[PDB]
């Protein structure tokens, strides 16, 4: 009846086992399970993610052991929070992380167990640092083809997620499926130390530790002189003369600005004499 | 701005709908009959010259640019005591 676009709140702790357990299955595809709480129709949260045994014979719906979860939920009771299960996830490192033929067969089984059972995919390969990558989807019922086939209200959270549209075969699965919005509920307490732990460990280890003399400048002078004539022949090549040769051509970069910063490296590193000492 | 978070926010655009007009009513409940000239063509009045005819309070439309070109009627029994420059309801004195 009434269906509203869902918003997925992921915890920074749940983001860990998505890429981490997925990295352990690389190259092969894994099968996980999502753990969280259903607040309402238009929003959903995943508060935890745990690792499930990887299948070396290929992913199947029987790869999830029911006594593995029954022993896990009991261990979650003695753990701080015993929250009910919600849905499943699987890695797909070998390709662009789209729902395979097994993923649709385990859909109607998991959506019978739990109401939503959001399908979540993840890939390591698409980037390293500055991209969300991952993936998510939710099955829209094929029996609804008799009814209105274009959910959801509050559109562009889908529509904008429908950008880039990610080639063809991916959105070729937009038949019988619709993706879901992933935003981050603020962990910033942990996220503030995530930046502090990362940059401090990357700043000279104490900031002190790190803080071929003339010879490095004799090797640099070959880049600061012998590179000049191959750079300064181009203005004489800009002289035609004049003018039979196709123009414009700009040879100014990148050596000029590199030798600039090359002195910026050597000047402030030589200031270590004046800085460290006295 | 963003109704894509919640669709009622698109139906909350209903707040942008507000009435505005100008009125030539003289005073109280009595409705005077006054017609004065306007130098703008009906092309502005079309909703897909020598002189125009404006109410005579129901009032008649005017564009903010047409307020300067209109002149109070000198032959009418009802003439405004206040100089007519911009729109809005203004007083109209009976001679
Ligand atoms: Zn699979």
Identify the CA nearest to A83 among candidates A96, A72, A68. A72
B73 neighbors B34 (Cβ within 8 angstroms): yes
What method did the depositors use to determine the structure? cryo-EM
| Resolution, Å (one decimal) | 5.8
- Give me the count of residues in chain B: 95
Contacts of B3 in chain A (CB under 8 A): 154
- The answer to whether the annotation marks A103 as part of a ligand binding site is yes
- Chain A nearest-CA distance from B24, in A, is 46
The two tokens of residue A217 are: 């400048």
DSSP A139-202: EPPGGGGGS-----BS-HHHHTTTSS--TTHHHHTTSSEE--EEEE---HHHHHHHHHHHHHHH
Contacts of A156 in chain B (CB under 8 A): 2, 4
Identify the CA nearest to A8 among candidates A134, A161, A118. A118
3 state DSSP class of A89: strand
- Helical residues (DSSP H) of chain A, grouped into ranges: 12-25, 66-78, 101-105, 107-113, 156-159, 169-172, 188-202, 214-221, 227-238, 255-270, 272-275
Interface test with B, best of A5, A154, A156, A163 (most B CBs within 10 A): A154
CB contact under 8 A, B4 and A153: no
The two tokens of residue A43 are: 């929003």
What whole-number distance in Å separates Cα of residue A270 and Cα of residue A252? 28
User: Using only C-alpha atoms, what is the Rg of chain A?
Assistant: 28
**Residue A49 class from Cβ within 10 Å (0-12 exposed, 13-18 middle, 19+ buried)?**
buried
The two tokens of residue B51 are: 């002189």
């Amino acid at each position: 009846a009434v269906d509203t676009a869902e918003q997925v709140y992921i915890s920074s702790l749940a983001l860990l086992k998505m890429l981490k357990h997925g990295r352990a299955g690389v190259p092969m595809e894994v099968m996980g399970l999502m753990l969280g709480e259903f607040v309402d129709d238009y929003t959903v949260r995943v508060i935890d993610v745990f690792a499930m045994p990887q299948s070396g014979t290929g992913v199947s719906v029987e790869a999830v052991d029911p006594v593995f979860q029954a022993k896990m939920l009991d261990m979650l009771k003695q753990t701080g929070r015993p929250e009910m299960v919600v849905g499943w996830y699987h890695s797909h490192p070998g390709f662009g992380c789209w729902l395979s033929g097994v993923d649709i067969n385990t859909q109607q089984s998991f959506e019978a167990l739990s109401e939503r059972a959001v399908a979540v995919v993840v890939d390591p390969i698409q980037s390293v640092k500055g991209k969300v990558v991952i993936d998510a989807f939710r099955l829209i019922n094929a029996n609804m083809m008799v009814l209105g086939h274009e959910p959801r209200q509050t559109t562009s959270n889908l529509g904008h997620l429908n950008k880039p549209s990610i080639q063809a075969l991916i959105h070729g699965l937009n038949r019988h499926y619709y993706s879901i919005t992933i935003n981050y509920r603020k962990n910033e307490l942990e996220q503030k130390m995530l930046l502090n732990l990362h940059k401090k460990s990357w700043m000279e280890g104490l900031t002190l530790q790190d803080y071929v003399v003339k010879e490095m400048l004799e090797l640099a002078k070959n880049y600061n002189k012998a590179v000049e004539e191959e750079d300064k022949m181009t203005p004489e090549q800009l002289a035609i003369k004049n003018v039979g040769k196709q123009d414009p051509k700009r040879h100014l970069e990148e050596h000029v600005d590199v030798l600039m910063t090359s002195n910026i490296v050597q000047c402030l590193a030589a200031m270590l004499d004046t800085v460290v000492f006295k | 701005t963003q109704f894509w978070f919640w669709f009622p926010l698109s139906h909350f655009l209903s707040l942008a709908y507000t009435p505005t007009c100008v009125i030539g009513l003289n005073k109280d409940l009595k409705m005077p009959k006054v017609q004065y000239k306007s130098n703008c063509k009906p092309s502005t009045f079309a909703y897909p010259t020598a002189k125009a005819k404006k109410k005579e309070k129901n009032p008649a439309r005017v564009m903010p640019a047409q307020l300067k070109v209109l002149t109070m009627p000198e032959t009418c029994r009802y003439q405004p005591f206040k100089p007519l420059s911009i729109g809005g309801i203004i007083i109209l004195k009976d001679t």
